[PDB]
Amino acid sequence: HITKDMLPGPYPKTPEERAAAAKKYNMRVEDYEPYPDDGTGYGDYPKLPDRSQQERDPWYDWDHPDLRLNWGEPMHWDLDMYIRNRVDTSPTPVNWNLMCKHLFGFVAFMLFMFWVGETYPAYQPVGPKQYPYNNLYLERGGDPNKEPEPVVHYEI
Amino acid sequence: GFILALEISNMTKNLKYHYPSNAFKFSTLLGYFPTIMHRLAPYMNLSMSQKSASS
Amino acid sequence: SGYTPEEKLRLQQLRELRRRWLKDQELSPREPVLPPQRVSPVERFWNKFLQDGALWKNVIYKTYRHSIFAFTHVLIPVWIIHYYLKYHVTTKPYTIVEKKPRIFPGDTILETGEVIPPMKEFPDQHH
Amino acid sequence: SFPKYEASRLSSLPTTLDPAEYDISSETRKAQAERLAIRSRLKREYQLQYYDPSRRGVIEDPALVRWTYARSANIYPNFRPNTKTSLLGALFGIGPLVFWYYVFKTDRDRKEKLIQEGKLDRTFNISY
Amino acid sequence: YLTHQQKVLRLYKRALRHLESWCIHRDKYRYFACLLRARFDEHKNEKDMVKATQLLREAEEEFWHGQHPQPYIFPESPGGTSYERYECYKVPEWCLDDWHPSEKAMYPDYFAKREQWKKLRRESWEREVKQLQEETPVGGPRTEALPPARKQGDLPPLWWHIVTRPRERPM
Amino acid sequence: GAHLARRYLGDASVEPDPLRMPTFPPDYGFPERKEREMVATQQEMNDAQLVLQQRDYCAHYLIRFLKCKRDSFPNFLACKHERHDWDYCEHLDYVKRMKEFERERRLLQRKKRREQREADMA
Amino acid sequence: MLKYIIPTIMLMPLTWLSKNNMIWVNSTAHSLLISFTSLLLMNQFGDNSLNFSLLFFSDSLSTPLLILTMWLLPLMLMASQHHLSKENLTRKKLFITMLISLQLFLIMTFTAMELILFYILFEATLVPTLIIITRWGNQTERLNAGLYFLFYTLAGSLPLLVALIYIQNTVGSLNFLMLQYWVQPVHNSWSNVFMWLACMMAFMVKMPLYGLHLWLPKAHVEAPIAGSMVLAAVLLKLGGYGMLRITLILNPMTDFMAYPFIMLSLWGMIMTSSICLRQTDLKSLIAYSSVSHMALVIVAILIQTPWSYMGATALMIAHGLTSSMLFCLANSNYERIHSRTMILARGLQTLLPLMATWWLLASLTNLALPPTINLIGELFVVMSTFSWSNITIILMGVNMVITALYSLYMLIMTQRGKYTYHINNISPSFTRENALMSLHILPLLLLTLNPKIILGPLY
Amino acid sequence: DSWDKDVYPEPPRRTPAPSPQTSLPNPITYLTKAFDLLVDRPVTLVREFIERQHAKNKYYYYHREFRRVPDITECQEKDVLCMFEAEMQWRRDYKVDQEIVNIIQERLKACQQREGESHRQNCAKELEQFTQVVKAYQDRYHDLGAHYSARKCLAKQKQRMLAERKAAKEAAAA
Amino acid sequence: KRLFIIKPSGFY
Ligand SMILES: CCCCCCCCCCCCCCCCCC(=O)OC[C@H](COP(=O)(O)OCCN)OC(=O)CCCCCCCCCCCCCCCCC
Ligand SMILES: C[C@H](CCC(=O)O)[C@H]1CC[C@H]2[C@@H]3[C@H](O)C[C@@H]4C[C@H](O)CC[C@]4(C)[C@H]3C[C@H](O)[C@]12C
Ligand SMILES: *C(=O)CCCCCCCCCCCCC
Ligand SMILES: [Zn+2]
């Protein structure tokens, strides 16, 4: 039974509208920040911090414990992406930039070394192994009719 | 490995403070591959789905 | 920092209700009230037969239950499988293909009696 | 002296390291007073119906309705064709289709040429 | 809103827990645990709201640089490998109202003893509603804390789900 | 290994190339060189079903060991003597490969000295 | 086909002339007898189709679609009982009359030997379908959904009418058997480029093709459950069945005219699969899931290989049962919470243990877990498209990953986590609801034993 | 007996005679005796009883035989009645040729398993026959498309024949 | 001690 005035609407132009808009979404009129009016269809839906639900207090008594939400709280435009089963934005022990540099450096270094170790293989001091009957020409599917090129190995 | 680990294992009892090292955190956090790829790939894919694919 | 004067009363009021609720969750000795049930004559026999320890006669039940299991879970399936393979699968071409047995120099073939000539004399050396 | 924490969109600034958690003025303290005032009013309405023993059903949540409504039905009436929406529409709408057309058209033109010449190995290719 | 004392106490608890994770061995932790206490006891009397604040901010920045990358967590605490584990066994109480009569018949005492709580809950509801609407200011409640019962025979307002909440190891 | 340092941290023309050996005529330096003999015929190996990498000069010992194993079943600790004989026979085959390798290394260095001698005078 | 046409028509007298309280029982029982007799259509010969008369015929392509159509009618009657339980008796019988008349048109559509007869019945399914959506839909948007459903189909159908009549004048007949022998190749000219588009765009919009699908999220969401089951299970397959017929008379022009539609389909399924990862409406998520599976069918029909035509037939029948089941599962929740939001009721596995088993099986077949016929059809198309171009394996594989992500996301949001505290009316699943899910999944899982009856004429 | 040995050839079997070199009891032999007694014997009795009942009620089914009819080459243009019979025969022969490729493939796969590690040499006969039939199958029924037919097969043949005719002529020009 | 375990109805 939600009426047209209780639903999201167009961008607030006059200062009075932002007051009505903020009251509609249960926010302080000084805390209500509509999205930029660039024509991407956000209207007057509040813009909330891009913080994952995993950050919210795990000990507070939530109406919806798994979603970390309170009945009537304005939900983030991307709530379904910030649920606890998805993207997590919690602070990390190591700075984000230093994480990428270390991981990229490790992978980049390892790949180069494998290439370095590819052109310089490590093998043992032995010549090619020898097999009889012309290097197993008949065993390896050689044509019975066309007699093979003779191959001879000598005792040593 | 046993000798190096056993002696290094024996040094935990000494009353000496710790020095947070990059190598230590690198091993502890699995090289950051989860902390990045499990926050970057889901974010990009799940943001293109809503902004571009749907809206 | 501690509880305000009213908070200590509320928790006590609830803590008494909560501890009373957890007592109601206990089941009476008769519960659960199971509707009347009938067992097979075989089941009744072992209920009283096995009361005495009698290690010599206790293994009988162990072999009894394992003997039944082998008959209903090993012997019957292998009968069905062997009957299925012998008279329905193996009667069709190439359904079961065996890697031919290896013949070594010195063996005797059971189909014709042929004896594969042994290998020539080796340059024997003890090492 | 330590490396000041650097925050990206996926690594939020810790509250402890946030300067906004220490410089507490009268407005900041009062600002939280009104936040908990509205948060308390909503927590009241929910519990009146949540705990009511004569209620069987679903407590309609207008916040939930407004969330889904904006995500689906209020988008187009708030859409304006401009430079941003037009360029993004073509780049993400038509770009991939043109890209994949030349990847596949080029590949099939290449392969079709070999088969006519006879240079493509199709010795045992009888399933298609 | 948190007071300076509240924030200071929390930093002391976290540092020991991370320091405890760093040391592992108890005696080594005991040695360093006291030294950490000493660094806190030397600023207890500081009555300068500005110099004291600078200490906390510098104290937190030191904690972050030295926090354990993988701090110990109690299994059922948020992040430990038992959190929400048994939430899959916690059934709401109202499900029993849907049981078949032949299924309630298995527990005549429990369900006979259950109507009392339902009888008790309905009777108390009207008083609980009246108590709240008379102690609520004109503009509505300003906090989530709830008043207790101010008489005898009256249960605290909004007790049903707090009292009847599922156990912690239901199955 | 150790010989890698003489090919990677050193001259490569003075070292054998396992992808190119042998680089000299087999009879060069061997008057009426003898040829290795295979005791086991092709049919015996074919009927014995030996893996191609085992269809080598060292065969006719593996066949005997395999024949023993089929016969000593379930005594799987037996036939140990035939294992050592085949292990030894393969070992002799491995050393000869090293001899071919050391022979290759010496011949390459021999070509080095010969070329330098006639090169320096010129 | 009169042994199925006439019995279907007799379901209308049965409904109107039966007691007031027996309209559901009698219609369900007799519509199941009709479905039982449709198994006689499996008298298929390896060289020739089963040609009954001058009007109707049934080959291995029509037979699986006919059995699916006649099998759904009783399932549609079981689903509709709850939300029609409190409606005027005459209007309950008008609703049932619409479903029967929709089955009457469908079975004649899948068996018509003459394409203009196919067009009339293909185009006649709109009237009963539109009436179901707009009259017995629940929301205000049902009125806007019918218009989108109406003018998208007609905008493509009317050009098809001109092309079909044009072909008859040139060829002398629209009989399918005649076209199999009198077909001539299509020369590469601008005139034939628009003949090709006319013959296909009608069938593309019904699949639907990515780009022309905006009517499907509206019609499949605002319709009642009975409407959503037929819309997604059969009516989407009139496009697939149409293309499988009309491409006979469009070679070799299909070699190059299929590029824009293959790119829209190959790329479209990634786009629509990704949309399912962020849908706030459970029913809408299932609707967008249809566009991805039907994108494989469009690619399967446009490459014209025996492995592609066998995959397409299996994919259509497989998706027919799976899509219908998913809508029913989502509807069982709606009949309790009366809302289509996905994140409103959670942890339902705690309150409805058996209904969560159906959710698991519905999701497993949706993501094509082998050896289900869902996987068989999808697997065959992937092999056929790989031979068309090896690079397509990237797009096919990426869609399998995304397909499994949203399938399990739907299963984890509603059937796992913590139950919503304030929803206290999740009554135990009725026998009607449980039997509805069994009648979907059980025949779906049985076809794995003998899948050759859903592999079409090229088996 | 059950199946024709000419279509599915199998080389003669050769089983080495046991030559034990141990005094221990070979368990397999004892299990073999037990299996032939507690499994093989009871199964045969049931099969023998079932077989006798079959002989009491004996009846036959026949392999359908199609008399050849004029093929597409002899059918006039746009003559459905002749084209219909020619096309149905082509579709029937298409199915038979598909199963012929299966028979050859079955022989090829059977050879690989039977010959063990010597398959790459002892199965050169099967591989060569497999390569020949597949190429014959490919030349006739490949690249026709989902809407294949006798007309499309004939046109592909005429294209192949023309290239062969021109290729021989062009080479003979030199 | 035996405690009553609350479950959803399993009869249906
Ligand atoms: C979810 C958001 C939307 C995502 C959109 C999809 C991703 C877009 C990625 C950017 C586009 C990349 C494609 C570029 C065109 C293909 C060029 C190419 O490199 O093809 C490689 C290979 C060539 O095969 P061929 O068809 O014969 O072409 C030969 C032409 N000289 O082609 C093949 O034969 C097929 C090889 C398939 C390889 C497996 C699939 C790759 C992904 C594997 C998982 C990730 C691991 C990557 C490392 C393994 C790579 C094989
Ligand atoms: C053999 C095993 C262990 C008995 C024991 O040694 O204690 C017992 C434990 C449970 C038994 C099974 C279960 O009771 C279920 C079946 C019940 C009947 O005993 C027939 C076979 C049946 C399948 C049993 C076979 C066997 O006797 C079992 C498997
Ligand atoms: C050479 O072919 C293998 C590469 C070397 C790996 C082994 C390294 C250890 C041997 C060097 C130390 C020698 C003293 C023990
Ligand atoms: Zn309802």
DSSP assignment of C45-62: HHHHHTSS--HHHHHHHH
Query: What is the number of CB-based contacts under 8 A between chain A and chain F?
Result: 80
Set of chain A residues whose Cβ sits within 8 Å of the Cβ of D74: 7-9, 41, 43, 45
CB H106 within 8 A of CB H70: no
Residue G399 in 3-state DSSP? helix
Closest by CA to A93, choosing from G422, D6, C88, is D6
CA distances in angstroms from G246 to G165, G200, G420, H6, listed in the order given: 13, 8, 51, 46
Q: Give D11's strand partners.
A: D8
Neighbouring residues of F84: CB distance < 8 A, sequence distance ≥ 6: C127
Cβ atoms within 10 Å of D59's Cβ, excluding its own: 19
Q: Give A40's strand partners.
A: D79
DSSP one-letter code for A81: T
CB G3 within 8 A of CB G66: no
| H residues 44-103 closer than 8 Å to G (CB) | 78, 80, 83-84, 87-89, 91-92, 95
Closest by CA to E57, choosing from D20, D32, B20, A95, is D20
Which helix (H) or strand (E) covers residue C9, if one does? Answer: helix C5-24
End-to-end CA distance of chain H: 58
Peptide bond into F22 cis (omega under 30): yes
Neighbouring residues of G358: CB distance < 8 A, sequence distance ≥ 6: G325, G329, G434, G437, G441
Nearest CA in chain E to C30: E107
Task: Show the tokens assigned to G72.
Answer: 């759904």
Closest by CA to A50, choosing from B39, G325, E90, is B39
Ligand 2 test: best mutation among C69, C71, C72, C75, most atoms within 8 Å of CB? C69
Residue type, G245: R
E98 and I7: CB-CB below 8 Å?
A: no
Long-range CB contacts (< 8 A, 24+ apart) of C63-69? Answer: none
Burial of C86 (0-12, 13-18, 19+ CB in 10 A): middle
Q: Mark A77-92 as b/e (b = at least 16 C-beta within 10 Å).
A: bbbbbbbebbbbbebb
Alpha carbon distance G23, G27 (integer Å): 6
Alpha carbon distance E59, E56 (integer Å): 5
F72 and H117: CB-CB below 8 Å?
A: no
Set of chain F residues whose Cβ sits within 8 Å of the Cβ of C105: 40, 44, 63, 67
Residue G446, ligand 1, Cβ within 6 A: no
E1 and D48: CB-CB below 8 Å?
A: no
Which ligand is nearest the CA of A117, by number? 3
Gap from B26 CA to chain G (nearest CA, Å): 30
Residue with tokens 């000041």: D4
Nearest CA in chain C to I3: C26
Residue type, G406: Y
DSSP one-letter code for D64: H
A92 and D78: CB-CB below 8 Å?
A: no
Alpha carbon distance D5, E57 (integer Å): 13
CB H42 within 8 A of CB C83: no
Residue C42, ligand 2, Cβ within 6 A: no
Neighbouring residues of H123: CB distance < 8 A, sequence distance ≥ 6: H108, H111, H112, H115
Set of chain F residues whose Cβ sits within 8 Å of the Cβ of C127: 84-85, 88
Q: How far is the CA of G153 from the centre of ligand 4 (A)?
A: 31
Minimum-distance ligand 1 atom for the alpha carbon of G270:
3
Closest by CA to F90, choosing from F122, F54, F115, is F54
Task: Show the tokens assigned to E146.
Answer: 């709830």
Residue type, G107: I
DSSP one-letter code for G57: E
Which ligand is nearest the CA of G425, by number? 4
Minimum-distance ligand 1 atom for the alpha carbon of D111:
27
Task: Show the tokens assigned to A101.
Answer: 């540099």
Closest by CA to G44, choosing from G56, G59, G54, G55, is G59
Task: Show the tokens assigned to H66.
Answer: 């199609």
Q: Mark F78-106 as b/e (b = at least 16 C-beta within 10 Å).
A: bbeebeebbeebbeeeeebbeebbebbbe
Alpha carbon distance D32, D42 (integer Å): 15
Alpha carbon distance A3, G139 (integer Å): 14
Alpha carbon distance C4, G383 (integer Å): 73
Closest by CA to C99, choosing from H28, H110, A141, H5, is H110
C120 and F39: CB-CB below 8 Å?
A: yes
H146: nearest CB among G47, G178, G309: G309
Residue G394, ligand 1, Cβ within 6 A: yes
CB G282 within 8 A of CB G329: no
Residue type, G356: A
Task: Show the tokens assigned to G207.
Answer: 């699949």
Alpha carbon distance D11, D6 (integer Å): 8
Residue E82 in 3-state DSSP? coil
Closest by CA to G337, choosing from G423, G225, G420, is G423
Minimum-distance ligand 3 atom for the alpha carbon of A123:
2
Write out the DSSP string of A111-155: HHHHHHHHHS----S------HHHHHTTTTT--SSSPPPP---B-
Alpha carbon distance G1, H112 (integer Å): 51
Alpha carbon distance G334, G414 (integer Å): 12
Optimal mutation site among H138, H140, H141, interface D, most CBs of chain D within 10 A: H138
CA distances in angstroms from H70 to C51, E157, H74, H150, listed in the order given: 87, 96, 6, 12
C111 and H15: CB-CB below 8 Å?
A: yes
Residue F50 in 3-state DSSP? coil
DSSP one-letter code for A94: S
Nearest CA in chain B to G268: B53
If you take atom 9 of ligand 3, which residue's CA is the nearest one? F1
Write out the DSSP string of G70-92: HHHHHHHHHHHTTTTTTS-HHHH
State this model's resolution in angstroms.
2.5
Alpha carbon distance G454, G65 (integer Å): 9
Q: Give H149's strand partners.
A: none
Greatest Cα pair distance in chain F = 75
Q: Is the alpha carbon torsion for G430, G433, G434, G435 positive or negative?
A: positive
Determine the length of chain A: 156
Q: Which residues surround ligand 3 with Cβ inside 6 Å?
A: A 122; F 1
Which ligand is nearest the CA of A124, by number? 3
Strand runs labelled E in chain E:
none
Alpha carbon distance C25, E107 (integer Å): 11
Burial of G299 (0-12, 13-18, 19+ CB in 10 A): buried
Residue D56 in 3-state DSSP? coil
Residue with tokens 């300068």: E48
CB G291 within 8 A of CB G272: yes
Set of chain A residues whose Cβ sits within 8 Å of the Cβ of F98: 125-126
Alpha carbon distance G300, A97 (integer Å): 46
Gap from A93 CA to chain D (nearest CA, Å): 9
Q: Mark D4-31 as b/e (b = at least 16 C-beta within 10 Å).
A: ebebbebbbebebbeeebeeeeeeeeee
- Read off φ and ψ for residue E32, nearest 5 degrees: -75, -25
CA distances in angstroms from H98 to A8, H3, H9, listed in the order given: 64, 19, 20
Residue C40, ligand 2, Cβ within 6 A: no
Residue type, H63: H
Q: How far is the CA of G83 from the centre of ligand 4 (A)?
A: 6
Residue I12 in 3-state DSSP? coil
- Read off φ and ψ for residue D4, nearest 5 degrees: -55, 135
Neighbouring residues of B36: CB distance < 8 A, sequence distance ≥ 6: A99, A100, A103
Q: How far is the CA of F2 from the centre of ligand 3 (A)?
A: 8
Q: I9 touching G, CB under 8 A?
A: yes
Structure solved via? cryo-EM
- Read off φ and ψ for residue F59, nearest 5 degrees: -65, 175
CB G432 within 8 A of CB G78: yes
Alpha carbon distance G279, C60 (integer Å): 63
CA distances in angstroms from A155 to A130, F25, F59, F60, F93, listed in the order given: 11, 14, 16, 17, 10
Write out the DSSP string of G330-386: HHHHHHHH---BTTSS--GGGT-HHHHHHHHHHHHHHTT-TTSHHHHHHHHHHHHHH
Peptide bond into G371 cis (omega under 30): yes
Nearest CA in chain E to B20: E66
Residue E80 in 3-state DSSP? coil
Neighbouring residues of G449: CB distance < 8 A, sequence distance ≥ 6: none
- What is the CB-side half-sphere exposure of residue G244 using CA atoms within 13 A? 27
- Read off φ and ψ for residue G180, nearest 5 degrees: -65, -25
Alpha carbon distance E70, E75 (integer Å): 14
Alpha carbon distance A138, H37 (integer Å): 46
Which helix (H) or strand (E) covers residue G50, if one does? Answer: strand G50-51
Q: Radius of gyration (Cα) for chain A, nearest Å?
A: 35
Set of chain C residues whose Cβ sits within 8 Å of the Cβ of E160: none
Gap from D82 CA to chain G (nearest CA, Å): 21
CB G398 within 8 A of CB G271: no
Q: B27 touching G, CB under 8 A?
A: no
Q: Chains contacting I with at least 3 CB pairs below 8 Å? A: C, E, G
- What is the CB-side half-sphere exposure of residue E1 using CA atoms within 13 A? 14
CA distances in angstroms from A83 to G318, G379, G419, I1, listed in the order given: 33, 33, 15, 40
Q: Radius of gyration (Cα) for chain B, nearest Å?
A: 20
Residue type, D38: I
D70 and A43: CB-CB below 8 Å?
A: yes
Set of chain G residues whose Cβ sits within 8 Å of the Cβ of I9: 428
Residue type, D6: E
CA distances in angstroms from G188 to B16, G192, G257, G259, H145, listed in the order given: 85, 7, 10, 15, 19
Q: How far is CA D114 from the centre of its chain?
A: 46
B46 and G277: CB-CB below 8 Å?
A: yes
CB D69 within 8 A of CB A8: yes
CB H137 within 8 A of CB H97: yes
- Read off φ and ψ for residue B13, nearest 5 degrees: -75, -25
Query: What is the number of CB-based contacts under 8 A between chain C and chain F?
Result: 34
Q: How far is the CA of G207 from the centre of ligand 1 (A)?
A: 28
Alpha carbon distance A150, A134 (integer Å): 6
If you take atom 7 of ligand 3, which residue's CA is the nearest one? F1
Alpha carbon distance D73, A42 (integer Å): 11
Residue B55 in 3-state DSSP? coil
Strand runs labelled E in chain F:
none
Q: Is the alpha carbon torsion for G12, G13, G17, G21 positive or negative?
A: negative
CB A52 within 8 A of CB A87: yes
Alpha carbon distance D61, F27 (integer Å): 96
Q: How far is the CA of G218 from the centre of ligand 4 (A)?
A: 21
Q: Give C115's strand partners.
A: C108
Q: Mark C10-38 as b/e (b = at least 16 C-beta within 10 Å).
A: beebbeebeeebeeebebeeeeeeeeeee
If you take atom 22 of ligand 2, which residue's CA is the nearest one? C69
Residue C21, ligand 2, Cβ within 6 A: no
CA distances in angstroms from B5 to B1, B8, B9, B11, B27, listed in the order given: 6, 5, 6, 10, 16
